[PDB]
Short mmCIF file of C-alpha atoms and ligand atoms in Angstrom, two decimals:
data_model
loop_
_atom_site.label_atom_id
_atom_site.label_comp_id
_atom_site.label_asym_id
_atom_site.label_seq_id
_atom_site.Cartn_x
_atom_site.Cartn_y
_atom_site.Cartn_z
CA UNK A 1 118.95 71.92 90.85
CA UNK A 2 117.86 69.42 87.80
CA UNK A 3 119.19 72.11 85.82
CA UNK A 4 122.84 72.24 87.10
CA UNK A 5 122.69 68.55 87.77
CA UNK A 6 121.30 67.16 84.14
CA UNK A 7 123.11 69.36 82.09
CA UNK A 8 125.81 71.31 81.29
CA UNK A 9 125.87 74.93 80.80
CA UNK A 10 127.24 76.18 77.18
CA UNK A 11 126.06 79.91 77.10
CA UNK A 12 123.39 82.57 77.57
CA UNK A 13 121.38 82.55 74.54
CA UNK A 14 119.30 85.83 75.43
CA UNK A 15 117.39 87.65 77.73
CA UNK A 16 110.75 88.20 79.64
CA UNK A 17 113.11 85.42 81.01
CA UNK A 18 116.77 83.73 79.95
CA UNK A 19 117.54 81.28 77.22
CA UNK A 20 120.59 79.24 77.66
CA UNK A 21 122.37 77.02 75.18
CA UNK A 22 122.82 73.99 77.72
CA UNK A 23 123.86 69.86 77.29
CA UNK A 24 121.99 67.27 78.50
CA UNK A 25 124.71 64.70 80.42
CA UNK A 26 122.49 61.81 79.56
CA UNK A 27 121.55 62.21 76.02
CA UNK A 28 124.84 64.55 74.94
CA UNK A 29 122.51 66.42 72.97
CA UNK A 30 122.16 69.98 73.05
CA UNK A 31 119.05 72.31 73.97
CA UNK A 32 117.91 75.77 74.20
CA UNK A 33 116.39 75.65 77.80
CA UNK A 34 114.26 78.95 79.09
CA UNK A 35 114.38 79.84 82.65
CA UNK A 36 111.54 82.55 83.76
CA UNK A 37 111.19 83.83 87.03
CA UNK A 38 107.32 82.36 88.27
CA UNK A 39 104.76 84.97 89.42
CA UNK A 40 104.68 84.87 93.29
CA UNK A 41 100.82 86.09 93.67
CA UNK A 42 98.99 82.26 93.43
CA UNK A 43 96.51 82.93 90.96
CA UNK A 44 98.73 84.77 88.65
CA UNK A 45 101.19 81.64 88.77
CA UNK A 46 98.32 78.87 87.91
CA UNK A 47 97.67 81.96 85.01
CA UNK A 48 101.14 80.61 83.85
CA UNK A 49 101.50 77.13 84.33
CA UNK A 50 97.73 76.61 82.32
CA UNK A 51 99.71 78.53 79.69
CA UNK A 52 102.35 75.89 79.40
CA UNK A 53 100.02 72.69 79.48
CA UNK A 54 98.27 74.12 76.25
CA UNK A 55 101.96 74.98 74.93
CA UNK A 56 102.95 71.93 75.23
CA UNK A 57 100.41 70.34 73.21
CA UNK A 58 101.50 71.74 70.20
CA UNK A 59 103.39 69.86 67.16
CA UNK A 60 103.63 71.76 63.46
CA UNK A 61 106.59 72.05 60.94
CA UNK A 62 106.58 75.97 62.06
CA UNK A 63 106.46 75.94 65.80
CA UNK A 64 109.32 75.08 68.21
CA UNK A 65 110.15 71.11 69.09
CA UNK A 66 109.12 70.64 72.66
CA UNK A 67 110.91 68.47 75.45
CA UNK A 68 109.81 68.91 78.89
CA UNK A 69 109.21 71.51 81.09
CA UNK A 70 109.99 71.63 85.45
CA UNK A 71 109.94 73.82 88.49
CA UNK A 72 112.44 74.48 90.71
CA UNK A 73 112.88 76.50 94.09
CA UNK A 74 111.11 82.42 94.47
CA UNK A 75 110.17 79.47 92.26
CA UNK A 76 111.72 79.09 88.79
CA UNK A 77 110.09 77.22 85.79
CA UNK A 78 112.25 75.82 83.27
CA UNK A 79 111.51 75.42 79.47
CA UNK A 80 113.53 72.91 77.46
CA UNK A 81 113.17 73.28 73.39
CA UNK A 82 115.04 72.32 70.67
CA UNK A 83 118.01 74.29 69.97
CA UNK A 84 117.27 76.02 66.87
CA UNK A 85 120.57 78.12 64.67
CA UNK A 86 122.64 80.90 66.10
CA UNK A 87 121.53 82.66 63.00
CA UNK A 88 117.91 83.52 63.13
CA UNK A 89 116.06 85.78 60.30
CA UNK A 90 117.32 89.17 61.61
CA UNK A 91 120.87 87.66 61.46
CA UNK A 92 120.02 86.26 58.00
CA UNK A 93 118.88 89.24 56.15
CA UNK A 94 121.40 91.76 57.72
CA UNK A 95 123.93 89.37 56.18
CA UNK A 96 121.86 89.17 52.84
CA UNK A 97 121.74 93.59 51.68
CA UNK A 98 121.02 92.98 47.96
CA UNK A 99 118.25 92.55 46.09
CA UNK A 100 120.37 89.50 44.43
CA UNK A 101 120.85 87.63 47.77
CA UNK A 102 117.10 88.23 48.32
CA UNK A 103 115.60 85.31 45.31
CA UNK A 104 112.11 86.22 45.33
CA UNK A 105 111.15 82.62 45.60
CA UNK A 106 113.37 81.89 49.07
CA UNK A 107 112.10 84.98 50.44
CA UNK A 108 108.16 83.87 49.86
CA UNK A 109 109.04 80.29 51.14
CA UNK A 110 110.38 81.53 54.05
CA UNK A 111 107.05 83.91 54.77
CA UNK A 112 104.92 81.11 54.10
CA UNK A 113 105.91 78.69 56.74
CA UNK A 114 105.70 81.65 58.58
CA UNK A 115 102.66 81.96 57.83
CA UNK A 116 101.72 78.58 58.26
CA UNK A 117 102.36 77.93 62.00
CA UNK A 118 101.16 81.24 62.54
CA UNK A 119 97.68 80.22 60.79
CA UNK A 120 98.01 77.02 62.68
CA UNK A 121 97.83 78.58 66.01
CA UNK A 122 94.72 80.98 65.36
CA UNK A 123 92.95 78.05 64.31
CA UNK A 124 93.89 76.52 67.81
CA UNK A 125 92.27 79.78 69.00
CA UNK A 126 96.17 80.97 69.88
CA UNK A 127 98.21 83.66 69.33
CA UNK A 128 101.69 84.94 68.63
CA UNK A 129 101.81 88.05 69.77
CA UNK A 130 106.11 88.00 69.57
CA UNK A 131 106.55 88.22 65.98
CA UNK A 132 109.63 89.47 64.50
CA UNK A 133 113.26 88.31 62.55
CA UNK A 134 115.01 88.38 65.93
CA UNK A 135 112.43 85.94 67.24
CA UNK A 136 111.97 83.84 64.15
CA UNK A 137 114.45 80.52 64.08
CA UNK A 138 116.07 78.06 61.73
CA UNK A 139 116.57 74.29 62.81
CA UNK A 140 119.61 73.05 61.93
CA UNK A 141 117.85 71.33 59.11
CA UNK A 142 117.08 74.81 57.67
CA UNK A 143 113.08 74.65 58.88
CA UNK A 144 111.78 78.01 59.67
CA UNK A 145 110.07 78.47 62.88
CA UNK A 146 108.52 81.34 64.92
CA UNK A 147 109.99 81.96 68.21
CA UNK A 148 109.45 81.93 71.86
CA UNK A 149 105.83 82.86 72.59
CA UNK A 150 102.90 81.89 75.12
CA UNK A 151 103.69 83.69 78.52
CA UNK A 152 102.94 87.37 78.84
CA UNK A 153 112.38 94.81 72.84
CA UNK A 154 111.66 96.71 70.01
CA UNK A 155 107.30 97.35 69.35
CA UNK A 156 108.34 98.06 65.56
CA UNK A 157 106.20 95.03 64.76
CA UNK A 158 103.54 95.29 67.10
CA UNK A 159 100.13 96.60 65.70
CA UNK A 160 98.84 99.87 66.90
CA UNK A 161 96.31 98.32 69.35
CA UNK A 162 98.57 96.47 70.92
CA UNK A 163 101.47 98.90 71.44
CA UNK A 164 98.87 101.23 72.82
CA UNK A 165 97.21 98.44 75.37
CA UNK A 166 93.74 98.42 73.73
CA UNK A 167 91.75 95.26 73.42
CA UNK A 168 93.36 92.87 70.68
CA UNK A 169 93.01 89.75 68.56
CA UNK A 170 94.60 87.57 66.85
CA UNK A 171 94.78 90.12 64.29
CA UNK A 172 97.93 91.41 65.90
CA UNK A 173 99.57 88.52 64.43
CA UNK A 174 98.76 89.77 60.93
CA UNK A 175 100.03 93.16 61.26
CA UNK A 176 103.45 91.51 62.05
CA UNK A 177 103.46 89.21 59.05
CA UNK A 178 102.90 92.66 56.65
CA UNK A 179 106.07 94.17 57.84
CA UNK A 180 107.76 91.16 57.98
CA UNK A 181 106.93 90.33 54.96
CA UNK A 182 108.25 93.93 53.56
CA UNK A 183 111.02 93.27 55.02
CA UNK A 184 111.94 90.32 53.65
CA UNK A 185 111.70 91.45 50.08
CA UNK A 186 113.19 94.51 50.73
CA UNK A 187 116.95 94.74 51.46
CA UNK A 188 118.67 97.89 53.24
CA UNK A 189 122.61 98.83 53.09
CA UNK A 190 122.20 100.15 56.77
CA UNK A 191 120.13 99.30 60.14
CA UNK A 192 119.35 103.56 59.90
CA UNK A 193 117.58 102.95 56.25
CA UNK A 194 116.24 100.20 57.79
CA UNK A 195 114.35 101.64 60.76
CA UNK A 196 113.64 105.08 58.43
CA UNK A 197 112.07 103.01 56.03
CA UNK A 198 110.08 100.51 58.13
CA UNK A 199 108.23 103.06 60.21
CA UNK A 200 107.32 104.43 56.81
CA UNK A 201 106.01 101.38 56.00
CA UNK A 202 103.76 101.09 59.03
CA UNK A 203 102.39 103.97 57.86
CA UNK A 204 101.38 102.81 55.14
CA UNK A 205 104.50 104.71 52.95
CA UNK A 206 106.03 102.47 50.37
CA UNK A 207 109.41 102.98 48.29
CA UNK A 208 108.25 103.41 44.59
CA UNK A 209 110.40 100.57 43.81
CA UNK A 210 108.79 98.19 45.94
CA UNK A 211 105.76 98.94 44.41
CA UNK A 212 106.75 98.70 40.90
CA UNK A 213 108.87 95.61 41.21
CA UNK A 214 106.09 93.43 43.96
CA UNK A 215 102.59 95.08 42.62
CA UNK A 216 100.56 91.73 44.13
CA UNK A 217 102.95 91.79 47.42
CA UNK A 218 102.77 95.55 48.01
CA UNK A 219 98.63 94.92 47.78
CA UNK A 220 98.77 92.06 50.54
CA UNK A 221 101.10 93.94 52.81
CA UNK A 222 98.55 97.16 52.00
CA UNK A 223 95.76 94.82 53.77
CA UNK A 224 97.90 93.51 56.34
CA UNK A 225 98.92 96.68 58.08
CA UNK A 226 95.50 98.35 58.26
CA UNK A 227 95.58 100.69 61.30
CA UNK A 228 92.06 98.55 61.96
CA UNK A 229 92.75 95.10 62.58
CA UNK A 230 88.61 94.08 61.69
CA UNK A 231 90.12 94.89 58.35
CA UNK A 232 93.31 92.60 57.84
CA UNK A 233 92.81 89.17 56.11
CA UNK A 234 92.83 85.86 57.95
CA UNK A 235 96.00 83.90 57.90
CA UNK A 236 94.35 81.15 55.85
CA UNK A 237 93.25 84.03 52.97
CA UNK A 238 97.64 84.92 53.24
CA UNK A 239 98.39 81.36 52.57
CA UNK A 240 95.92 80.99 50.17
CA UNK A 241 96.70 83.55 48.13
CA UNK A 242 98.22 83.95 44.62
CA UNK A 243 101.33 85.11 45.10
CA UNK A 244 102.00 81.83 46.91
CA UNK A 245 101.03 79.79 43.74
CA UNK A 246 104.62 79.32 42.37
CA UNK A 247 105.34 76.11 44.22
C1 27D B 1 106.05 74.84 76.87
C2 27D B 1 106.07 75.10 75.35
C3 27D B 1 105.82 74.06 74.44
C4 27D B 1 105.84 74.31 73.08
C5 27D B 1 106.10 75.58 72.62
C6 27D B 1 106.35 76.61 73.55
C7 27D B 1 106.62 78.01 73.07
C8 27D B 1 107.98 78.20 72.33
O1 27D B 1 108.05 78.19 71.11
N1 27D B 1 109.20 78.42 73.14
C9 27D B 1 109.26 78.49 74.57
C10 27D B 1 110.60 78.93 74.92
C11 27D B 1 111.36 79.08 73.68
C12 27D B 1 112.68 79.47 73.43
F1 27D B 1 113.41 79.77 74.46
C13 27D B 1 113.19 79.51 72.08
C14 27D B 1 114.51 79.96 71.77
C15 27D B 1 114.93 81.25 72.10
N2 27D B 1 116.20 81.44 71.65
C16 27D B 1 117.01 82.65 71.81
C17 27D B 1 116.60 80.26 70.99
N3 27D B 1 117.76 79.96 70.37
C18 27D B 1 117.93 78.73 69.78
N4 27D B 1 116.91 77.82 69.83
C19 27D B 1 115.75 78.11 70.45
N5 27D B 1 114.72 77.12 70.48
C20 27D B 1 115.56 79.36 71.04
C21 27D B 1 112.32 79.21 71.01
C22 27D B 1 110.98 78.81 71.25
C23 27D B 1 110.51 78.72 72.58
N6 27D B 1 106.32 76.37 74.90
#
């Protein structure tokens, strides 16, 4: 309706819902514009659209640029964002399999502003909840930010309590960040190593060399994938820490 008549379709950027790549007619600029099927049971649809006036209240460095958001008749709600790269951080490491094209320095930069919006959020008494590479963005000025989030794929990420439907905190967030964090210091020549290695790592396995070469890293990520979340750090004590020191 307003969709087909303000802009104009590019592509299908993914598909909880659809993301399409789509120009606005008026302001020729493009946007990546979710479209999610809304909950026909009445209270479970004001669940959502409560969801989406605290979204949109947001504004930090780390978290998605916001435009607007509108229904449209089944009812359909539409999500308009900034379009971030076609590359996002799964993309960006798979493309990146030595330790050379992983600079310590760019790796811990790019973690921190994960970090960041993700600390940012808690403090708003938010969570994630979707954190992973595939769902972690670039703007086209190069500014990390964590993906599509706020209204509810692989569970390789996902902390134990949540995978398993127990009660949860924000301290699923944290559990993410460790293996993210791995990850992104940690290269592998094929997805197979990749997968082999990581659900080592959830369990708390670690290749020798990564804890030779990143003693103070391998110690964080230790905390960060407890099995109990009580026991994982706050995202301020992640940020804060030393390893982050090296401007
Ligand atoms: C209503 C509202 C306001 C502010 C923030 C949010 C939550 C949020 O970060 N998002 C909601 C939909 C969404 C979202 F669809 C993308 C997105 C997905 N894909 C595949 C993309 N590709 C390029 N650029 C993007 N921005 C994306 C990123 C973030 C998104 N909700």
């Amino acid at each position: 309706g307003r969709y087909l008549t303000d802009f104009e379709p590019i592509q299908c950027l993914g598909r909880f819902g659809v993301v399409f790549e789509a120009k606005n007619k008026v302001d020729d600029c493009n946007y990546a514009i979710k479209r999610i099927r809304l909950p026909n049971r009445e209270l479970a649809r004001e669940k959502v659209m409560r969801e989406v006036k605290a979204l949109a209240k947001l504004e930090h460095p780390g978290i998605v640029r916001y435009f607007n958001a509108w229904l449209e008749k089944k009812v359909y709600l539409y999500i308009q964002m900034q379009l971030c790269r076609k590359e996002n951080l799964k993309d960006w490491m798979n493309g990146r399999c030595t330790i050379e094209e992983r600079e310590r320095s760019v790796c811990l930069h790019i973690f921190l502003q994960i970090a960041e919006a993700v600390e940012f959020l808690h403090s708003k008494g938010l969570m994630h909840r979707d954190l992973k590479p595939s769902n972690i963005f670039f703007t086209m000025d190069d500014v990390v930010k964590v993906g599509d989030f706020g209204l509810v794929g692989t569970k390789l990420y996902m902390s134990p309590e949540q995978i398993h439907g127990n009660s949860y905190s924000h301290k699923v967030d944290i559990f993410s960040l460790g293996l993210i964090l791995f990850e992104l210091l940690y290269p592998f020549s094929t997805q197979m190593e990749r997968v082999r290695t990581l659900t080592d790592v959830r369990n708390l396995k670690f290749p020798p060399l990564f804890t030779q070469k990143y003693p103070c890293e391998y110690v964080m990520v230790q905390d960060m994938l407890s099995p109990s979340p009580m026991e994982r750090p706050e995202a301020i004590n992640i940020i804060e820490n030393a390893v982050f020191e090296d401007l």
